[PDB]
Design a binder for this molecule. Structure first.
Ligand SMILES: Cc1ccccc1NC(=O)c1cccc(C(=O)Nc2ccc(F)cc2)c1F
Ligand SMILES: Cc1ccccc1NC(=O)c1cccc(C(=O)Nc2ccc(F)cc2)c1F
Ligand SMILES: Cc1ccccc1NC(=O)c1cccc(C(=O)Nc2ccc(F)cc2)c1F
Ligand SMILES: Cc1ccccc1NC(=O)c1cccc(C(=O)Nc2ccc(F)cc2)c1F
Ligand SMILES: Cc1ccccc1NC(=O)c1cccc(C(=O)Nc2ccc(F)cc2)c1F
Ligand SMILES: Cc1ccccc1NC(=O)c1cccc(C(=O)Nc2ccc(F)cc2)c1F
Lengths: 155, 148, 146, 150, 138, 155
């Protein structure tokens, strides 16, 4: 079929591609982050959220890709080819999973609407030539639990 | 981490292993069944259900694993060497995704608890030797006052 | 001693021998069924039932002969003597444990009384010559006193 | 699976390992003790108790292991392989069943709680060096109304 | 026995590994910090806190570990013993010594909040990462 | 710094040296005892007691010491240097940890002043020449809280 993994999350593959290749953390940094922030939730018998379900598959899937590419490597006769298949995976699909794991980790950390707002805010910022570009990049942070109008009300 | 893809859906990796490798359809037949029964829902911009979400990633991820395994196969030069790869795929990640594709498709079709009690029913049926096993495999699927 | 492992469960070794040796599943298929169907019960600190006690040590006891089986392949300089051992484990005591593992798994799955009536019904059915015998084999489908 | 045979009886494999190997009686002395003390119960067609169920399996399963070790004695031509297995059966597996047979026989004779407190008591006692260790080894052992006198 | 030194203090070995190995100061700078900030408490006959008790053992244990490495490194090329401590026990103790010293200095909740804040910050590539790193208050 | 690991527990290094070096069990036998008596407490997320905290760190530190000693002893050629690495552990760090492990394990089992009263009682006992020394060593058992006469008086 033509399945977009971001469509059920109010985004698209093309929208995620608006962020430059060098913006996303490495795969290991994303995997280490998901474990640090969400290991209890990711291993729990609760759905928790659609982001948890997607992130659970993506972590396992990338593991399967690395498991298969590494096993094929240990069979190649040339030791200089030991990591050749792993390198092909990282160049052919490495960015795809870096987008996917970053999208779900950040959406759980900052909120989906906040993440999508930051996406277009940073994509315009990074494409501004540096002479006109302000030094402070757009900040990605969670919105406050209660609004200012609410706090002044209960005063 | 130690993430069981089936734990959030009320099953385990070990429970799905109870079904033999030759029970599951081919991955090509499994993908065509997900398209036939659920193409519009799987492509919709809606969560629909956690099965839909998981099934969406599995279909895409298998495409990643298939073109990698195919690339390794068509770039090899030895029928022995590429039978090694096919036998590794069929035993490990190929079997893993035939299980996960079957679990979610069937859960969307027959129901999760119907699927699970079928799982244990067929698993002991197929392990009964043929001379004692019934030839029929298990299937996957008022008062008088009421009329007055 | 003279302990019969089935006496406390309402059967005897001779009654279990009424079933032909090829009726029982393989040990691999029996151990996988005990796991898929009763993993959490067999591992819990609960007695559950006398079947669970017998099953627990039956699994561990077979695991002892099958860990003796991987042992005759890492410590034996004679791959012949390696094969003479694993052949005895699987075809001599193997039939014995297939009977024992099948008995307790089936009793927890279908009921001890149901299993015993099936045992007699199938044993007579398998011994009926096939001309007179119906082609379909008979179908197999909490508190304990001291 | 990951089954601990003592878990359902309020103990663990690691706890039984706290007793040194030379503490347990021999298998022969264990079988003779279960026979002298519980032959009729173990042979009866009653469940009796979970300790009886477990002890019945252990006695028979050890019988299978000894039958194999005697069979392997006449049927294995290579002596280096034959005596490697008969030693592996009566030493590595022997210690395994010496704990099992001792645990269930002792629990029937002295009670599960008395057995568990003794196990811990002897483990720290036998690990105390003999110069500081008391010579008495810890012991494993086990109504009238007022109207009668007035 | 599978004991996690951080478990009784509300953390895990896995959570501490989220901080990169180049974030922690050296054991020497960490021991010098514990001396400047807590010598009187650490040498006193009072428990003070479980953090003090754990920190007391860790300081002494590093002494035991370095004396053993010193004796091997001398009484016997042995640049592997220095590369062993630097890459194995050194990182294990830099994490442990930092955890307890920072908890006494800033608070367990504040240290844990900073831990996940810096771990995500340092993993953001510098192009998108803000210039001001998260701080430990002091 | 100059930390005495027994100071916060009402003892000193000098006081623990009063016990002969052959009075203590091996480190293995002491660790075997700690697991058999306190595996649940030592692995629990609760502080329990300062003794639990100290015993916690001592167990892990011995693993660090033995792993470093193993790696050193593994990559040595001459077996005499192998035996020299094991002999260093035996005479130096082993005695210190046999004292520290025994002190905390006993304190959790019998109480601080019971093991301290026993320490001085055995240290004087074993230093008595065997001719005047009673044949049976003093027993390590917790002091009965009160006498039986006072127990019946307050019944
Ligand atoms: C963390 C922090 C603390 C304190 C102050 C700022 C930040 N961070 C940021 O302002 C930030 C800006 C752009 C992108 C990211 C990101 O995408 N990081 C990221 C996402 C997922 C992941 F797994 C690893 C790193 C930022 F964090
Ligand atoms: C369909 C039908 C019509 C009419 C009558 C019966 C059936 N079917 C079944 O009783 C059935 C029994 C066992 C396993 C399966 C399965 O696993 N199929 C399957 C699952 C996923 C998939 F993608 C493709 C095929 C059955 F369908
Ligand atoms: C399962 C089923 C579903 C549906 C319909 C029938 C069956 N089964 C049977 O009619 C059956 C008949 C004889 C013996 C056995 C058995 O003893 N199997 C067995 C027991 C334990 C074990 F570990 C493995 C296999 C049967 F299941
Ligand atoms: C009997 C007695 C009479 C009189 C006084 C004492 C005893 N006994 C004991 O104080 C005793 C102490 C340690 C271990 C055992 C044991 O484990 N024995 C054992 C267990 C199982 C078995 F099959 C054979 C012997 C003790 F009996
Ligand atoms: C146990 C017993 C049972 C029964 C009767 C006596 C004892 N024991 C003692 O009267 C005893 C006397 C001095 C020192 C020790 C010790 O220090 N042991 C020790 C401490 C820690 C450890 F991990 C291992 C052994 C004693 F046990
Ligand atoms: C001190 C200060 C004064 C003034 C302004 C800022 C700071 N500090 C920090 O913003 C800080 C940020 C990250 C990590 C550390 C740390 O972990 N340091 C550390 C911890 C233990 C130790 F032993 C030695 C150094 C920071 F201090």
């Amino acid at each position: 079929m033509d399945i977009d993994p971001y469509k059920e999350f109010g985004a698209t593959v093309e929208l995620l591609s608006f962020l430059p290749s060098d913006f996303f953390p490495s795969v290991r940094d994303l995997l280490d982050t998901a474990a640090a922030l969400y290991r209890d939730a990711l291993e729990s018998p609760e759905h928790c959220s659609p982001h948890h379900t997607a992130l659970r598959q993506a972590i396992l899937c990338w593991g399967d890709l690395m498991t298969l590419a590494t096993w094929v490597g240990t069979n190649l006769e040339d030791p200089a080819s030991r990591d050749l298949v792993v390198s092909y995976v990282n160049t052919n699909v490495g960015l795809k999973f870096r987008q996917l794991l970053w999208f779900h980790i950040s959406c759980l950390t900052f909120g989906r609407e906040t993440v999508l707002e930051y996406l277009v805010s940073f994509g315009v910022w990074i494409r501004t030539p540096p002479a006109a570009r302000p030094p402070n990049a757009p900040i990605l942070s969670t919105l406050p639990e209660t609004t200012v109008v609410e706090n002044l009300y209960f005063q």
